[PDB]
Design a protein around this ligand. Structure first.
Ligand SMILES: Nc1nc2c(ncn2[C@@H]2O[C@H](COP(=O)(O)OP(=O)(O)O)[C@@H](O)[C@H]2O)c(=O)[nH]1
Lengths: 450, 467
């Protein structure tokens, strides 16, 4: 079993049991207070609970590493990504470009960099699913006159032209089985939708992925992000020089403030709380925050309000134009130990996706002030109720074990919101009473890549 | 790495994180309420928290069993107990009793059955530690004139006579090395004390025991209880027949309500409701993972009127109890073979239950809890005590080690730094324990989660010839 594994499991269990003893006793006392005394005691109660809750979280972290688990998870995550990158690379580099099935993707969607990048990711996932080589059209790119390849590696070494014996607009994989070159539109108008879309995961990888990673959907998205953003040597060098110039070092928490309005304190409470967690398992000499924002006055405000934090930020005037800022910001957010921001932002999502490629399982190393993780155009995100729920208020929905719940969001207060598809009712339910429903799709497995 | 293990670990982690989201949000709302509305919301809050906390505990239970862990823990616990029983049996059965080193123990300490049995255990552990065959003197035992063997097997198949070429009172292992027969008195005045006492565990078993079991000290005590209470054939048949006549079936929770002479002197009176709160909560835990058709309680008590009171107050529970045994425990009748049979049976069924609610100040409940350790791989946490933590009368000081610093909020609390040795007096079951910080010489309250147990070890003989 492992002595440390057993010691830690029992200490998590006893720690939670002592938490419950404490909760019952203190809540019973809180019932008899009022006014200011009630607030004093409730606030002390909260402070005590936080440290206690973090000791449980710290033991759970140690449990995840103990008795070789950390090393095994790292090796397996490495094997999985090398497997997928090998398949993508095999698909992308046919020997005869003239006879390859192709899918043509135009990068120049009318939106920002993160949205354009996710459009290429969506093209790539469908190309992978249909066994078509992705051809990326990037001329007249707003972010770089020379196009994609002046900044990132070409998505193929052997096949970058869209020539073929037959060309057509996407009409479905079977309908298109004999069209060599298929042009794919933006996801918003895609008809018919193939199954090769988030949040599903390939069947042949699903079992291994669940063993390794807490959100396989994001891991799967991130393999395509990883391949796409292979940087040219000069950009790799620029990122290296910025790291030294900015003093970007660990531990560091990334904060992306996109401008509902959220005040800086709403981000920073989660920053501080995560640094308290980290201090239980490592020495934190300086609390470093990488701040990405489109508000030029926010940086000054953060430094003044949090003088014990070192705020690192990118105020690049030139390279050593907006493309420079977004690349550096996404890079440093993705490299942080924890990410605080609103997943409604594509930039925040991109950083979180890239972060998955830097650790065996970074799925939980974020806090979003609004949305849960999603991919624009994804199929319905469903959960499965595991425990019954009886609504206490009219804003809550009932659940029985097995009910399919279409989740709209997590309110980060103990409750989530969604629709109970068995009942046709929408409302609030306790977040702990459902589990994620991992969707799978039969993808090609490209055995020839091995 | 096993898939279920990973799924469960993550759900425990996410379950706790959601618990913390819920705590912060709901406490913020409670701060703005007062009076009756505050009391209603607090009570709903408590109800919601209980189900949520039990989901976390249920996932932790599954984690302990998953991916072969349950099978492995069961086999290793079985290998450990077979090893120790084999060593004890080897010690207890020398080839020539007339040439064997012996330790003589008299069962008739001036106290009740559990205290007397624990005296024999203390004798036995010292005999095992000193490589002396235990000789149990039990004639004129207050519970049975005919002695231990009227109910239990003799503690040896080959060596029950106390004779030898030399006999002496205990004076220590080195001094007594050439005394064939050593007489051991009660623990209260033993000098010099040997190290073979609770709560320490043998060095040679400590690592394996920490791997399998949440309280090795009790497991070690329980091996000697297990050997001692091997039943005579007639008692074995009686226990089997009582099991069938009582309808004793699982799941069942054992409740020992000790009253009579215990109250005031060594413990307090506790009303039935204080026991049943913990019974009800544990059945709520069990219903998470199994079907509970009937909520069964095995009630052992020295109060004969309690059974009817309990049935009336808890009409949806099935109370399994022998009310003639409760009467047999009355003070005037207590030291009789009738009463002995009753307390052996009550302790047996308590020990067989899936969970135990009692007052550990009573030796009866501690015996049941010790026996329970021999029936499961790790039953160390399957109790709730209304007063004391587990202890063994005569043990060496029970110490803990602070793992997280504590800064006192009230005058009743003690400070702690990591590494401080804390002498625990008790757990108040409210988040705080009480003890002395030995570094500071200060006594008071500290958060129970901020210490770990200090497992003590002693070099014992290993009887390699027993293999
Ligand atoms: N059968 C039975 N006898 C009991 C019960 N409670 C107390 N007694 C009797 O009272 C004695 C109490 O002495 P002891 O075992 O040393 O435990 P303590 O006095 O409770 O710490 C027991 O040994 C029994 O003889 C009970 O629940 N059932």
């Amino acid at each position: 079993l492992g002595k440390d594994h057993e010691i830690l499991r029992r200490r998590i269990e006893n720690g939670a049991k002592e938490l419950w003893f404490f909760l019952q006793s203190e809540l019973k006392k809180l019932k008899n207070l009022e006014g200011n005394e009630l607030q004093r005691h409730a606030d002390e109660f909260l402070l005590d609970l936080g440290h206690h809750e973090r000791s449980i979280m710290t033991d759970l972290y140690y449990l995840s590493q103990t008795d070789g688990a950390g090393d095994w998870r790292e090796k397996e995550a490495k094997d999985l990504t090398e497997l997928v990158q090998r398949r993508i690379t095999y698909l992308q580099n046919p020997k005869d470009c003239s006879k390859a099935k192709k899918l043509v993707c135009n990068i120049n969607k009318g939106c920002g960099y993160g949205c354009q990048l996710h459009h290429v990711v969506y093209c790539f996932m469908i190309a992978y699913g249909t066994q078509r080589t992705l051809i990326l059209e990037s001329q007249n790119w707003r972010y770089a006159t020379g196009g994609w390849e002046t900044v990132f590696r070409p998505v193929s070494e052997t096949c970058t032209d869209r020539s073929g014996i037959s060309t057509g607009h996407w009409s479905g994989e079977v309908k298109d089985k004999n069209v060599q070159v298929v042009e794919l539109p933006i996801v918003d108008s895609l008809h018919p939708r193939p199954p090769y879309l988030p949040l599903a995961v390939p069947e042949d990888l699903a079992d291994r992925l669940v063993r390794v990673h807490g959100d396989p959907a994001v891991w799967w998205v991130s393999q395509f992000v990883k391949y796409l953003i292979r940087p040219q040597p000069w950009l790799e060098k620029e990122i290296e020089e910025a790291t030294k110039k900015l003093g970007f070092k660990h531990p560091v928490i990334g904060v992306h403030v996109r401008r509902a309005f959220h005040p800086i304190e709403e981000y920073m409470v989660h920053v501080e709380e995560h640094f308290q967690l980290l201090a239980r398992r490592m020495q934190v000499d300086k609390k470093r925050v990488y701040l990405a924002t489109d508000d030029p006055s926010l940086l000054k405000e953060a430094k003044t309000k949090y003088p014990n934090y070192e705020f690192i930020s990118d105020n690049s005037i030139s390279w050593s134009n907006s493309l420079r800022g977004v690349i550096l910001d996404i890079h440093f957010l993705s490299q942080a130990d924890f990410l605080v921001c609103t997943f409604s932002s594509q930039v925040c999502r991109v950083a979180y996706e890239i972060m998955q490629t830097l650790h065996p399982d970074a799925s939980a190393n974020f806090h979003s002030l609004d949305d849960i993780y999603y991919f624009g155009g994804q199929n319905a995100h469903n959960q499965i109720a595991i425990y019954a729920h009886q609504p206490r208020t009219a804003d809550e929905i009932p659940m029985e074990p097995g009910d399919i719940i279409g989740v709209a969001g997590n309110h980060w207060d103990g409750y989530s919101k969604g629709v109970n598809r068995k009942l046709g009712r929408t409302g609030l339910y306790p977040s702990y009473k459902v589990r994620e429903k991992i969707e799978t799709v039969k993808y090609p497995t490209y055995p020839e890549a091995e």
